[PDB]
Amino acid sequence: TKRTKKVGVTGKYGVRYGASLRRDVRKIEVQQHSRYQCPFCGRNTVKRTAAGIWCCNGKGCKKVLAGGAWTVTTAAATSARSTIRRLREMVEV
Amino acid sequence: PSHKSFRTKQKLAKAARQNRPIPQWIRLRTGNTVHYNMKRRHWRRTKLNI
Amino acid sequence: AQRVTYRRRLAYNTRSNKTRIIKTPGNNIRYLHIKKLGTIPRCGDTGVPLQGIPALRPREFARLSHNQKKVQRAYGGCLSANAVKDRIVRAFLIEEQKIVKQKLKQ
Amino acid sequence: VSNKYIIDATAAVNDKIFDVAAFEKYLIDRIKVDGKTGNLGSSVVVSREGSSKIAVIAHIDFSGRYLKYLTKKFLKKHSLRDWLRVVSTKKGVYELRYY
Amino acid sequence: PRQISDIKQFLEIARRKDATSARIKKNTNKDVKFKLRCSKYLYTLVVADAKKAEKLRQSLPPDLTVTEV
RNA sequence: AAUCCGGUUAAUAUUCCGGAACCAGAAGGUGGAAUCAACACGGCAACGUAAAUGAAGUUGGAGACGUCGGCGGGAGCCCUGGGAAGAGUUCUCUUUUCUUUUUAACAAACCAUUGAACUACCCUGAAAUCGGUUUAUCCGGAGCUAGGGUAUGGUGUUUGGAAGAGUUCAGCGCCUCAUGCUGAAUCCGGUGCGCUCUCGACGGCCCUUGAAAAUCCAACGGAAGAAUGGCCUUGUUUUCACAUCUGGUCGUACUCAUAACCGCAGCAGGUCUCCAAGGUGAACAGCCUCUAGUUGAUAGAACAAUGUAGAUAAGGGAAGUCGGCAAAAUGGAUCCGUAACUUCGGGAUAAGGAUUGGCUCUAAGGGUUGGACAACCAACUUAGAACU
Ligand SMILES: [Mg+2]
Ligand SMILES: [Mg+2]
Ligand SMILES: [Mg+2]
Ligand SMILES: [Mg+2]
Ligand SMILES: [Mg+2]
Ligand SMILES: [Mg+2]
Ligand SMILES: [Mg+2]
Ligand SMILES: [Mg+2]
Ligand SMILES: [Mg+2]
Ligand SMILES: [Zn+2]
C-alpha cells in the first residue's frame, strides 16, 4: 500500500515546521540516504557517513570517498573536473 | 567519610582528646579556677569545621 | 530473594564497576567484580581483527608466550593474511615495472 | 519394583495407646492409588502387619512421605498428637517416638 | 589446583623436592583422591579403584608424608 | 598489574584465621628446547606448537569511547514435576501445604555438540530455470549455493578446587570439660515475547559522527655472537616448566538520614547512586503478601458549637457566581462507527454506539519424539457455543 501520497520520508515530522520546509527537507533526505554506485568497484554499495563522506562495503574497495553533503558528487565539482581536465590537456599539448 | 586524609585523621584524634573531662585534682589546686570549661565540644552540637 | 551490594566503595555503574552474580558454596548470592573484555589486535592495513590471537586487555599480552601473540608468517600479528598477500604481489609488480622503465629509458 | 516401607510403632504399643489393628484398616481404606481410594487390587500396594510393623509393599514407585502423612492423620484422629511423633530412621522406615 | 591424569606423572611430582605432603581422601562412591601439595599447586589424582589405590599408595616414595583425611 | 571461598569478634575483615590462588619486580636455583658451524618444525592454505637468538631505527595494534530499536545466547532470579528430611493443618477434605535440597576465584581439556555461527577467514568448485538468506533485504564470476577446514571461547560442558566446606535432620555422653562424639540426606527432571545483568550478530539516526595519556603487545629491520679433537667439552632461551626472594606508605569503626549530613533542633524541607521476591495487571501503576525492618511519632476520657479532611442526598439541574470556582460525570479492553477543516502528515480515543462475570465445551494456530502416518511429554493464545 502507498501509506502516504506526498510527505514520504518526511512523514516522521508530522504536521510541524511548514509544508515548504518539509518538502525541501524531503528532496535532500531522499538524496542523502540513497545508494550510489562505486566507480571503482561497480557495486551500488555507496552510502553516506557524515556529510561529505561516502563509504563502501564488501571485502574489496573498503575505500572512503570525499563527496557532497547530500550526494556523492555535486554539479559544481563535476563541472570543475572537466574544466580542469580541459586546461590540463591544453597545456600538455 | 571513612575516606579521609592522614592530616584530617590526626586532627580528629586531637579533637577527641580535648573533648574530655578535667581530672578533679586539677581544680583542687590552691588558686585554680578550672572548675568548669566551655570547651566541651559534642559532635551533634558544635562542628569542628575541619 | 537475595539482594546484593557492591564489594568496593565505588557506588556507581561505571565501566570500571562491572559485576556479575555468583552463587557460592555457602548458598550466598553476591557480586563478583570483573574486568572489561579484551580486544583482538587489528590489521594495520585493513582494520580487520587478526586471526589466531586471543582477545585480552593490553597488559595481559605481556604474559603470553611469543607464538600466541602472532602468526608464523611475514608481518604475523601485525597484518592480516590477505593484506600481506597484497603487499607481496604489489611489491613484486611495482619492482618489475621499475625494471622495464629503467630498461626503456636508455 | 518392590518397596519396603515400614511404620515401626513399638513405643506406643507398649503403653497400650496405638491400635495397630485400627491402623491396618486405616491405611488400606486411606491409601490412594491413581487418585482413588480402594484401588489396592493387590498388584500395586499390599500392606500387612509385622506384629509391631505395618510394613507396606509397593509396586508403583510409592512415596514414604505419603505414609508419614497418613500416619500423622491417624495419630490426629485419635488425639495422639502432643504424645507421639513419626520419625525417619532408615531407608523407607519410620518410627513413633514420644519426644 | 591441578588435576593429574597419569599415575606415572603423579609419582614423578612426588619424587620432587617441593612435594611436602600427600593427602588421601576417600569419597562415598568408593573413589580415592590422592592430593599432592607443592609450593604453587595442589595436584589431585583420581583413582577409581581400591586395588589400584593400594598399589599406588605402596608405589609412593618411602620418605613422602602421606596424611589420611 | 593482581583474590576467592568457608570460618571468626561485643565491636574489623575481598584486610584476621583455615584452605586455595594470582600479579609485579630482582637475582639466576634446577630442568627442558635450538644451535657440529646459526638461531625449530608441521599445514596447499586459513594457521598450529611447551620452548623456537633478535640491538638501533621505524611502523602497526591495544588502552579508546554516541544514541535508539528489535533479534539470538549465557548467568542469577522466577515458575514447575518427582524423591528425601523436618514442620503446619487434619469435624470433614487435602498421595496435602511450607522450608532445605548449595558449589567461588583459580587450573585443565573440550566446545556452535548440549544452547548460541557458516561470525570471520581458507581450500575444492564455478552459479540463469539464478540461488542463498534475516523478525528486519542483504549477499555472490571482486567467486554464490554446497562439501571440508582454520580462528575467535565462557557467566557453556566434563573435571580439579570439593565435600573435607556449607545446609537440613536424628542421637550419645549430660556439672561435663578443649563442647566434644556418632549417624542419615544434601538426589533426579523440565520451562520462557518473563525479570536483572551480560555477551553476539545486526538495523536506524546526525549541517551532532560521539577524550586524552600512562601502559602493554606485534611487526619491518639486521646489530651482535663465536665450540669442536666424529666426542667427556660454551653461549642463548627463564616471550618454555618447576623453584627462591621481595611487595613500603596513607585510608578502612559507624551513620548516609521522618534522630549521626545541611537547614539555629532528634525540623513533614533538601542531598548523587547499586541490588529488587509472589499474586492481580500492559506494567518498576494501584492494591494484598514473603524475606528484612518497624510497630516510632505525649497520653486518658468525652462526642458541644465552629472548623480541617473525607462521604451521601428527594425533586429540580448553574436558577448560584465576575466566571461551573469546587465537585460531579468520563475512564481499562474488544468490536462497530467517526464531521468541519487541513500545511494531506493530521484532525481522531473526534463525535456516537455495543460488549465485558462464572462454569462446561468446540475450533484453529507450534515443538520434542517410533515403528502416508504418532503414543506421550513440553506449551502458550485467539475466536466461538451452551448453561448460569
Ligand atoms: Mg560492622
Ligand atoms: Mg565498614
Ligand atoms: Mg546540622
Ligand atoms: Mg440531588
Ligand atoms: Mg435523584
Ligand atoms: Mg439535565
Ligand atoms: Mg446566572
Ligand atoms: Mg444572580
Ligand atoms: Mg475544576
Ligand atoms: Zn566500491
Curated annotation (Swiss-Prot), chain A:
Its main location: cytoplasm. A zinc finger (C4-type) spans 38-61. GO terms for biological process: cytoplasmic translation. One of its GO terms (cellular component) is cytosolic large ribosomal subunit. SUPFAM superfamilies: Zn-binding ribosomal proteins. GO terms for molecular function: structural constituent of ribosome; zinc ion binding. It comes from the Eukaryota. Keywords: Cytoplasm, Metal-binding, Ribonucleoprotein, Ribosomal protein, Zinc, Zinc-finger. It is found in: Cytoplasm. Pfam families: Ribosomal_L37ae (PF01780). The keyword Metal-binding applies. InterPro entries: Ribosomal_eL37/eL43, Ribosomal_eL43, Ribosomal_protein_eL43, Ribosomal_zn-bd. Disulfide bonds: none annotated. NCBIfam families: eL43_euk_arch. Component of the large ribosomal subunit (LSU). Mature yeast ribosomes consist of a small (40S) and a large (60S) subunit. The 40S small subunit contains 1 molecule of ribosomal RNA (18S rRNA) and at least 33 different proteins. The large 60S subunit contains 3 rRNA molecules (25S, 5.8S and 5S rRNA) and at least 46 different proteins. HAMAP family: Ribosomal_eL43. PANTHER family: 60S RIBOSOMAL PROTEIN L37A, LARGE RIBOSOMAL SUBUNIT PROTEIN EL43. Belongs to the eukaryotic ribosomal protein eL43 family. There are 2 genes for eL43 in S.pombe. This is Large ribosomal subunit protein eL43A. It comes from Schizosaccharomyces pombe (strain 972 / ATCC 24843). The gene is rpl4301.
Curated annotation (Swiss-Prot), chain C:
The keyword DNA damage does not apply. The keyword Nucleus applies. One of its GO terms (biological process) is cytoplasmic translation. Keywords: Cytoplasm, Nucleus, Phosphoprotein, Ribonucleoprotein, Ribosomal protein. The modification Phosphotyrosine is found at Y75. Pfam families: Ribosomal_L34e. One of its GO terms (molecular function) is structural constituent of ribosome. Component of the ribosome, a large ribonucleoprotein complex responsible for the synthesis of proteins in the cell. The small ribosomal subunit (SSU) binds messenger RNAs (mRNAs) and translates the encoded message by selecting cognate aminoacyl-transfer RNA (tRNA) molecules. The large subunit (LSU) contains the ribosomal catalytic site termed the peptidyl transferase center (PTC), which catalyzes the formation of peptide bonds, thereby polymerizing the amino acids delivered by tRNAs into a polypeptide chain. Belongs to the eukaryotic ribosomal protein eL34 family. Component of the large ribosomal subunit (LSU). Mature yeast ribosomes consist of a small (40S) and a large (60S) subunit. The 40S small subunit contains 1 molecule of ribosomal RNA (18S rRNA) and at least 33 different proteins. The large 60S subunit contains 3 rRNA molecules (25S, 5.8S and 5S rRNA) and at least 46 different proteins. There are 2 genes for eL34 in S.pombe. This is Large ribosomal subunit protein eL34B. The gene is rpl3402.
Swiss-Prot record, chain D:
Transmembrane segments: none annotated. One of its GO terms (cellular component) is cytosol. The modification Phosphoserine is found at S42, S43. Its main location: cytoplasm. GO terms for molecular function: RNA binding; structural constituent of ribosome. GO terms for biological process: cytoplasmic translation. It is found in: Cytoplasm; Nucleus, Nucleolus. Keywords: Cytoplasm, Nucleus, Phosphoprotein, Ribonucleoprotein, Ribosomal protein. Component of the ribosome, a large ribonucleoprotein complex responsible for the synthesis of proteins in the cell. The small ribosomal subunit (SSU) binds messenger RNAs (mRNAs) and translates the encoded message by selecting cognate aminoacyl-transfer RNA (tRNA) molecules. The large subunit (LSU) contains the ribosomal catalytic site termed the peptidyl transferase center (PTC), which catalyzes the formation of peptide bonds, thereby polymerizing the amino acids delivered by tRNAs into a polypeptide chain. Belongs to the eukaryotic ribosomal protein eL22 family. Component of the large ribosomal subunit (LSU). Mature yeast ribosomes consist of a small (40S) and a large (60S) subunit. The 40S small subunit contains 1 molecule of ribosomal RNA (18S rRNA) and at least 33 different proteins. The large 60S subunit contains 3 rRNA molecules (25S, 5.8S and 5S rRNA) and at least 46 different proteins. This is Large ribosomal subunit protein eL22. It comes from Schizosaccharomyces pombe (strain 972 / ATCC 24843) (Fission yeast).
Curated annotation (Swiss-Prot), chain E:
Keywords: Cytoplasm, Ribonucleoprotein, Ribosomal protein. Its main location: cytoplasm. It comes from the Eukaryota. The keyword Translocase does not apply. GO terms for molecular function: structural constituent of ribosome. It is found in: Cytoplasm. InterPro entries: Ribosomal_eL38, Ribosomal_eL38_sf. Gene3D superfamilies: 3.30.720.90. Component of the ribosome, a large ribonucleoprotein complex responsible for the synthesis of proteins in the cell. The small ribosomal subunit (SSU) binds messenger RNAs (mRNAs) and translates the encoded message by selecting cognate aminoacyl-transfer RNA (tRNA) molecules. The large subunit (LSU) contains the ribosomal catalytic site termed the peptidyl transferase center (PTC), which catalyzes the formation of peptide bonds, thereby polymerizing the amino acids delivered by tRNAs into a polypeptide chain. There are 2 genes for eL38 in S.pombe. Belongs to the eukaryotic ribosomal protein eL38 family. Component of the large ribosomal subunit (LSU). Mature yeast ribosomes consist of a small (40S) and a large (60S) subunit. The 40S small subunit contains 1 molecule of ribosomal RNA (18S rRNA) and at least 33 different proteins. The large 60S subunit contains 3 rRNA molecules (25S, 5.8S and 5S rRNA) and at least 46 different proteins. This is Large ribosomal subunit protein eL38A. The lineage of its organism: Eukaryota, Fungi, Dikarya, Ascomycota, Taphrinomycotina. The gene is rpl3801.
